[PDB]
Design a protein around this ligand. Structure first.
Ligand SMILES: COCCOC[C@@H](C)OC[C@@H](C)N
Length: 341
């Protein structure tokens, strides 16, 4: 009886995906979850992860490749790879040349989640919910503190977002952009932020304990759906702001020391089935990377422009680039200053 160890983001699979896979294959799955690319990167760089499959964002996977922590995927063992959208593959290939190591899973944007009724109560019916001004303008964040503000604990994403908002290159390579204007704005906003966290904001939005957050798109749409099913009167929405936003592509990868690679390939092939991955999108409110799966995705998810955004919105999205050690050091130091103080 072989097993399979999977490490994925929290709130990123359907409730029955693993159980259905177990029943069909007789494999027992050990499934654990994270909410931080930094936590996963640290595990991969410090020693064995103990997992057969892990799911980093592609921009982090680029750095992980330089350490040799993944096994190149045997495409002969992934017959339905063709189901993957070739345009998303090409974007991920910027981080993973010729798509040797990573299987695109889901993708979304880093935008603004908010409580519709509370934001209009505080900022009025003309609140700029289509703009990063809603939370990155100090005058606005000071008022929204009344009902709670959270930021992702995602340093590379938050700094890229702030740099873009400031009219800088989102992937600026000038240290002074981080230590000066980016830090200046974040510290002006810092007094109004209740916490930095990358998963507690989902239920807090759903229960009405925070009213605005920097959040991941599908996470916020999950919060909205949780509130509706609870019939608690909380109306949550998500915005991809007009100034653009970061896009991310989360990918399955196979640690080089994975014990049960054959079982791992069986699970990747299971995910490449259009019906399996469309069912996941239906429950987690994320766009998958499977072009063959799109007709099976529920209308509610597939037609949500905050999940599958239209071309004019996609044209304003940016992606993270890997920085050299100098900028990495300055960004991390600045992040700690922003959070603590
Ligand atoms: C659904 O297929 C299109 C996939 O586009 C992904 C978006 C983020 O890229 C467009 C920008 C990044 N150049």
């Amino acid at each position: 009886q072989k097993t399979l160890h999977i490490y994925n983001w929290s709130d990123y699979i359907a409730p029955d995906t693993v159980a259905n896979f177990e029943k069909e294959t007789g494999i027992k799955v050990v499934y654990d979850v994270f909410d931080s690319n930094e936590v996963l990167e640290g595990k991969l760089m410090a020693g064995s992860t103990g997992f057969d499959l892990v799911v980093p964002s592609a921009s982090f996977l680029e750095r992980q490749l330089t350490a040799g922590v993944f096994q190149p995927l045997d495409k002969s063992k992934l017959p339905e790879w063709k189901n993957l959208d070739p345009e998303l593959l090409k974007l991920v290939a910027k981080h993973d040349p010729d798509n040797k190591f990573a299987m695109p899973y889901m993708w979304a944007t880093t935008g603004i989640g908010y409580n519709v009724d509370k934001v209009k109560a505080v900022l009025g019916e003309n609140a700029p919910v289509d703009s990063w001004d809603l939370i990155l303008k100090p005058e606005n964040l000071e008022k929204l503190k009344s009902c709670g503000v959270s930021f992702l604990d995602a340093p590379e994403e938050v700094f890229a977002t702030v740099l873009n908002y400031l009219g800088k290159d989102p992937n600026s390579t000038k240290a002074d952009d981080y230590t000066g204007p980016a830090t200046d704005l974040l510290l002006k906003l810092r007094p109004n932020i209740r916490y930095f966290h990358s998963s507690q904001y989902i239920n807090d939005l759903a229960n009405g304990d925070i009213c605005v957050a920097i959040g991941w798109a599908g996470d916020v749409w999950q919060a909205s759906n949780r509130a509706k099913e609870a019939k608690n009167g909380v109306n949550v929405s998500f915005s991809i702001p007009k100034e653009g936003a970061m896009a991310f592509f989360d990918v399955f990868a196979m640690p080089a020391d994975a014990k049960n690679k054959d079982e791992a390939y069986q699970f990747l092939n299971y995910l490449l089935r259009p019906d399996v991955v469309a069912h996941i999108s239906d429950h987690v409110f994320y766009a998958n990377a499977n072009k063959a799966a799109t007709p099976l995705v529920s209308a509610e998810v597939r037609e949500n422009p905050g999940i599958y955004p239209p071309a004019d919105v996609r044209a304003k999205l940016f992606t993270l680039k890997v920085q050299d050690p100098k900028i990495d050091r300055v960004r991390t130091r600045a992040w700690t200053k922003v959070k603590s103080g």
